[PDB]
């Protein structure tokens, strides 16, 4: 039951990072509200 009817959580987003490495940036000084 719980895998299917449970409340979704951001914990399961860990999978999104699989295979991505952190090894050219647009520079922004501040972000408005």
């Amino acid at each position: 039951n719980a895998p299917y009817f449970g409340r979704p959580s951001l914990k399961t987003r860990a999978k999104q990072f699989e295979g991505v490495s952190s090894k050219n940036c647009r520079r922004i000084e501040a972000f408005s509200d």
């Binding site: 860990a14 990072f17 952190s22 940036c25 520079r27 501040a30 972000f31 408005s32």
Partner: protein, 109 residues
């Protein structure tokens, strides 16, 4: 105790920091922000890096993690978020909370 607390940060702040590590460029975090009609959710996954830039001042790198998202998810993201959040950015450490709030307010639209 640390996991009950991370769960609370998820429900209070709509963000989860999955892990942190230090590599050759600096201190990094894997992060997801957003909220979960059961089909209505708005979530961005990104890496956030803290790197020594010029004069050893810590700069922040944002690198969105978009490879595994579907075209439907991206369209929805793009309709809610500013265009700059779809590329790698650099910004001052003093703007970090402003950055979080920009993604948060956008995801909550």
């Amino acid at each position: 105790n640390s996991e009950v607390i991370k769960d609370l940060y998820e429900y209070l702040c709509n963000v989860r920091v999955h892990k942190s590590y230090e590599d050759d460029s600096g201190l990094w975090f894997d992060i997801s922000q957003g909220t979960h009609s059961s089909d209505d959710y708005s979530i961005m996954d990104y890496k956030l890096g803290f790197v020594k830039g010029q004069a050893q001042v810590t700069e922040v790198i944002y690198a969105p993690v978009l490879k595994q998202r579907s075209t439907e998810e991206l369209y929805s993201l793009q309709s809610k978020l500013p265009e700059y959040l779809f590329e790698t950015l650099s910004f001052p450490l003093s703007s970090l909370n402003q950055f979080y709030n920009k993604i948060a307010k956008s995801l909550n639209k």
